[PDB]
Amino acid sequence: AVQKVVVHPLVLLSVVDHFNRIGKVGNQKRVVGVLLGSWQKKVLDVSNSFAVPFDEDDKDDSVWFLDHDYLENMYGMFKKVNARERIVGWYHTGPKLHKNDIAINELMKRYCPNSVLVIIDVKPKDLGLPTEAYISVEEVHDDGTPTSKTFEHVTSEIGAEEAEEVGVEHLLRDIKDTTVGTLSQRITNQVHGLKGLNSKLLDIRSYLEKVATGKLPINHQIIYQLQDVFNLLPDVSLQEFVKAFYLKTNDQMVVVYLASLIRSVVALHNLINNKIANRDAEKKEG
Amino acid sequence: TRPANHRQLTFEEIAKSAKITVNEVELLVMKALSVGLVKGSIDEVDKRVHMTWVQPRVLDLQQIKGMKDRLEFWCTDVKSMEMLVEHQAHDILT
Amino acid sequence: LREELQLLQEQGSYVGEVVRAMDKKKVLVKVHPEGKFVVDVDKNIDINDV
Amino acid sequence: CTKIINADSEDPKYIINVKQFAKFVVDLSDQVAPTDIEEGMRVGVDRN
Amino acid sequence: AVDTAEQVYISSLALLKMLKHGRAGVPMEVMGLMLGEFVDDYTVRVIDVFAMPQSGTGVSVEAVDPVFQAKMLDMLKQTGRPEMVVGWYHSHPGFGCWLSGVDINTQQSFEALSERAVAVVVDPIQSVKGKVVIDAFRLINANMMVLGHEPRQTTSNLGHLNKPSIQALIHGLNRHYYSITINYRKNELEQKMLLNLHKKSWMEGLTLQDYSEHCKHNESVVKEMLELAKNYNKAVEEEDKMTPEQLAIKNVGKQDPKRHLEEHVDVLMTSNIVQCLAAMLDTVVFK
Amino acid sequence: KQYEKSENDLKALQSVGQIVGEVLKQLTEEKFIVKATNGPRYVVGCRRQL
Amino acid sequence: SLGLGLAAMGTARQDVYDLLKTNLYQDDAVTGEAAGLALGLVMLGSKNAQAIEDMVGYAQETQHEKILRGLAVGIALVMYGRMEEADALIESLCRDKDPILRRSGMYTVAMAYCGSGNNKAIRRLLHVAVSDVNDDVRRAAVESLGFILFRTPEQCPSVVSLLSESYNPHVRYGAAMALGICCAGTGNKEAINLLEPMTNDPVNYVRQGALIASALIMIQQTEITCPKVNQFRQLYSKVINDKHDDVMAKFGAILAQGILDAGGHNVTISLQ
Amino acid sequence: EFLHAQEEVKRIQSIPLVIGQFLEAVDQNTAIVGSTTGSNYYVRILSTIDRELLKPNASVALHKHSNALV
Amino acid sequence: ENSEKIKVNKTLPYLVSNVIELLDVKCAVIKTSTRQTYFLPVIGLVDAEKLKP
Ligand SMILES: [Zn+2]
């Protein structure tokens, strides 16, 4: 059971270039490569990657090629230049995963047993998702379902490292916004923080429309049982939470009589100091 | 049946629907708190039973339909009142 | 402030006691933990100021 | 210049001290005769 | 046909492979190869960087493995892109950048093979704050040794990107090689996906950082601001004609006037507004 | 068995050392004052979870 | 080609236009400056269908940048004083992320709006003069001020009064040339008051452009006409007989000697 | 730009710094400091430290390269 | 090929030293003739049973 993966920011980048290498002839719309990593704890780390020649045909949709020979020797070279690094899994792109991914994963679990795949989104780069990591489990099934492979979820993030954030800050130099700017910046944090509140809402909007309609089979295990836990929270009981709002008056009180008065009086000093310096330099000009 | 709208249930509703006597509704709810399918509390001067409930189970498809309507009211409150904030604070946004 | 930040990002100087001066803008200085040295002067300092 | 402690057979394996710096184990160069590298002898030693 | 003011293009991944391989072997002067393309007469670009295994000799021509050369190139032809080598690099940790003795010997082999084969020297441990100490250099001949080296001509982009630094011009630099200009091939489809994905937090914008940690902070700052107001009273009621611009410079204390003023009041303003706006929006949204 | 010892040696080629010192006092929660066994004093920190 | 485009400047002749196209599609790196400049000169003030379209279509897929900088001035020079008809092209070139092509649009908005006090021009050109990130396009913003305001030279010292006092030298450089090209040959003494700290800058090349702009303003002006003539002739003579300045620092000085006595004191510069 | 000037100044003091001792004060913001490495130096100091903590002596922090008082 | 690589990685300039103690969590403390104390996670091209303080 893997806790989470850590995206070193060289690997994604090194997927973008190889998608751009074949992209002049790119019509396969997918690039499989090998995900090198550093196994630390239950938490996982990723440091490097490389590619592999890959083909696949939708006709019979099981005809494909992972070059074992290319995977042995080139990883052997990265072992020689760096003994710290080993394989932890693989990756592909083209955000809709395809039916073959059971076959690639169950093949190269004989290189690392708890292997893990990461889907990146090279063209989608817009709203809320950097990557995603999948994992395989095989229990009986459930209480009552037929057995299968069933790609499961591992939560993901983007990590960093000292002496690579230097390459982050120096290569961008573009907008260079700090978190400070507490009037302008924090309000916009509340703005687009809420623009994802309806974005996750419109996603949970669309899911129960197409399962109440009843197209896809209802996941009786987690897909609403975790929502059954969720939908009781929102407590808004009034007549004691109405009495939260003299603390609102208390938070107001420091703003009103302290910050409006002193800011006005200090700028009033700048009037008399200027009106003296105006005319006493004017009457001494002649 | 009432999803936390006014979840402070009165004792007579339990004593009628469970058809248990009035004096044993307290020993009945202390057992359900002892098992752990509910995490409420008990008043006795008013004999109203306050409810906080964390135990999940199946919901027959019909309760998704009511869950859709509550999610749609949830939609236009988030959507329209964000348009209020953005149009008000547009010039300090950048 | 930027002019203040650039001048502080600069290697520090050494302190050394002058024994006595040579001729033509040269002196005789042991630093602190080394041998003695015959070095050159800058523009603003003079032999007679030593 | 340094001083030599000893040598080993079939190879240089020269053990050399400074008495102020550290003690190195180094190789002979090309311009030497390997006979006159007797022990306790002051010898000219490269910097690199 | 002779040199001008050139330009060096480096890819975004190339610089990241430099600093990572330098940070890995920080004591022992790591070594690697540089793979790019010669696009014209006098602008060079590089797309790719792969390193070298550590040799016991050090940074020299003996650290180049020819069987690790050709077989690594054998793989990159059939996968990704085949292209010609255009140079090399190493790391020099003890100083910023200048070609040393064994540096310049292996350069002569490369310029005998290639046209230019530009060297690259990077200190990994000096680059800390927000800038990188990277510079690329290129050896000169002995035919113009009593003449002016770097034969540069009709351009005006030579005075930038560095003046020759004195820790670098005390060695070779001038009458031995020349310095060259380096900018970055900054691209889209990489820039925003590095920016938005590295610094991001969704639900942080409407958290509360509570009240029990926050009313205590509002409690504290007002108390010394009261004494700051008492110190603000003291200078205002003073108001003497002791040449008050000279009276202020003989009363410097890194203190009151206007600097130790409303700066605190601005922090008291911004903290409570972001606290109360987050409080009012959360009552609005949720039921 | 011989190839096992060779691959252990290829693993055994990155012991860039560690510096032995002693903690003099605690400055803050993540700042300390240490000193080398023959060298100067420093202000340091820990790794992550020490 | 530079000689052919200059002698046949403004002809809109088809035969010189045709062989300049097949010169452009040679795809050599070093004649790209040669093809692009002459292709604009034969199509100066034309607003042709194929001229703008082929040049703006060619200026993205190429691999060099001398090919781009020749076509940068060339598509700026194919339109001249249209004053409203370039606005779709002005919006198109600046919205692109090519830094040379954004710079090329800044020379295009200069040449389409010559001598007119357009409020929309001075709003938009100053807007990208603030917010843009590349230094070269920021210069061509603040260099284009004299091209749109030389008819009324009085506003130019007032608007470049604080443009000469930015933090980067690139804005201060194009500020100095803007004094040189707005006011052509006036004995202003207000711009000369501005140029005196400009030639006393820490950075070398902004002093260089200050020396050239001081040379541009005071050709054929005696000491009785304005009292700053012989002050700067010996200032030019000081820095040219100085030893410890840059070649960059003295390139403007020897050029200022060439400007100040040009034509044997018989000709002048006057865009008006 | 005034905030980025504040940021790059106020992260000069979060470095694994070396420890020295204050020895003498020359003038405004320039002093002699002796290090625990010996070999007495002469550096410029910051613009932040209140100067009432350096009267004959102080345990002080020093930069690695520029060796300034921090 | 591995033994050839170890052959070219045993340079010449062997800095002699002194081993003071040995630990496990394989671990050893090294004092050089520069009188500097070092610590290792990995010993190297020897055997720990062949060594001693
Ligand atoms: Zn070197």
Curated annotation (Swiss-Prot), chain A:
Gene Ontology terms: biological process: proteasome-mediated ubiquitin-dependent protein catabolic process
Keyword Acetylation tagged: yes
Chain positions of cross-link Glycyl lysine isopeptide (Lys-Gly) (interchain with G-Cter in ubiquitin): K176
Keyword Acetylation annotated: yes
Note: Does not bind a metal ion.
Protein family membership: Belongs to the peptidase M67A family.
Species this chain originates from: Homo sapiens
Gene Ontology cellular component terms for the protein in this record: cytosol; extracellular exosome; extracellular region; ficolin-1-rich granule lumen; membrane; nucleoplasm; nucleus; proteasome complex
GO molecular function, one term: protein homodimerization activity
Protein name: 26S proteasome non-ATPase regulatory subunit 7
Keywords linked to the UniProt accession: Acetylation, Isopeptide bond, Proteasome, Ubl conjugation
Subunit structure, as described in the record: Component of the 19S proteasome regulatory particle complex. The 26S proteasome consists of a 20S core particle (CP) and two 19S regulatory subunits (RP). The regulatory particle is made of a lid composed of 9 subunits including PSMD7, a base containing 6 ATPases and few additional components. Within the complex, PSMD7 interacts with subunit PSMD4 through their respective MPN domain. Interacts with TRIM5.
Gene name tied to this protein: PSMD7
InterPro entries, sorted: EIF3F/CSN6-like_C (IPR024969), JAMM/MPN+_dom (IPR000555), MPN (IPR037518), MPN_RPN7_8 (IPR033858)
Residue ranges annotated for the MPN domain, each copy included: 5-140
N6-acetyllysine PTM positions: K200, K210
UniProtKB/Swiss-Prot annotation, chain D:
Region of the whole protein represented: 98 to 145 of 433
Subunit (UniProt): Component of the 19S proteasome regulatory particle complex. The 26S proteasome consists of a 20S core particle (CP) and two 19S regulatory subunits (RP). The regulatory particle is made of a lid composed of 9 subunits, a base containing 6 ATPases including PSMC2 and few additional components. Interacts with NDC80/HEC; this interaction is detected only during M phase. Interacts and SQSTM1. Interacts with PAAF1. Directly interacts with TRIM5. (Microbial infection) Interacts with HIV-1 Tat.
Protein name, as recorded: 26S proteasome regulatory subunit 7
Induction: Expression is not cell cycle-dependent and occurs throughout the cell cycle.
Function description: Component of the 26S proteasome, a multiprotein complex involved in the ATP-dependent degradation of ubiquitinated proteins. This complex plays a key role in the maintenance of protein homeostasis by removing misfolded or damaged proteins, which could impair cellular functions, and by removing proteins whose functions are no longer required. Therefore, the proteasome participates in numerous cellular processes, including cell cycle progression, apoptosis, or DNA damage repair.
Post-translational modification: Monoubiquitinated by RNF181.
Residues recorded as bearing N6-acetyllysine in the entry: K19
Domain of life: Eukaryota
Compartments where found: Cytoplasm
Membership in a protein family: Belongs to the AAA ATPase family.
Swiss-Prot record, chain G:
Ranges: PC repeats: 1-33, 34-68, 70-103, 104-139, 140-172, 174-208, 209-249, 252-272
PTM-bearing positions, type N6-acetyllysine: K243
Subunit structure: Component of the 19S proteasome regulatory particle complex. The 26S proteasome consists of a 20S core particle (CP) and two 19S regulatory subunits (RP). The regulatory particle is made of a lid composed of 9 subunits, a base containing 6 ATPases and few additional components including PSMD1. Interacts with ADRM1. Interacts with ZFAND1.
Protein family membership: Belongs to the proteasome subunit S1 family.
Biological role: Component of the 26S proteasome, a multiprotein complex involved in the ATP-dependent degradation of ubiquitinated proteins. This complex plays a key role in the maintenance of protein homeostasis by removing misfolded or damaged proteins, which could impair cellular functions, and by removing proteins whose functions are no longer required. Therefore, the proteasome participates in numerous cellular processes, including cell cycle progression, apoptosis, or DNA damage repair.
UniProt name for this protein: 26S proteasome non-ATPase regulatory subunit 1
Species name: Homo sapiens (Human)
Gene name of the encoded protein: PSMD1
Section of the entire sequence shown: 478 to 749 of 953
Curated annotation (Swiss-Prot), chain H:
Subcellular location as annotated: Cytoplasm; Nucleus
Superkingdom, natural source: Eukaryota
Signal sequence extent: none
Similarity field: Belongs to the AAA ATPase family.
Function (record text): Component of the 26S proteasome, a multiprotein complex involved in the ATP-dependent degradation of ubiquitinated proteins. This complex plays a key role in the maintenance of protein homeostasis by removing misfolded or damaged proteins, which could impair cellular functions, and by removing proteins whose functions are no longer required. Therefore, the proteasome participates in numerous cellular processes, including cell cycle progression, apoptosis, or DNA damage repair.
Subunit structure: Component of the 19S proteasome regulatory particle complex. The 26S proteasome consists of a 20S core particle (CP) and two 19S regulatory subunits (RP). The regulatory particle is made of a lid composed of 9 subunits, a base containing 6 ATPases including PSMC4 and few additional components. Interacts with NR1I3. Interacts with PAAF1. Interacts with TRIM5. Interacts with ZFAND1.
Name of the protein described by the UniProt record: 26S proteasome regulatory subunit 6B
Organism the protein comes from: Homo sapiens (Human)
Lineage of the species this protein comes from: Eukaryota, Metazoa, Chordata, Craniata, Vertebrata
Gene transcribed to yield this protein: PSMC4
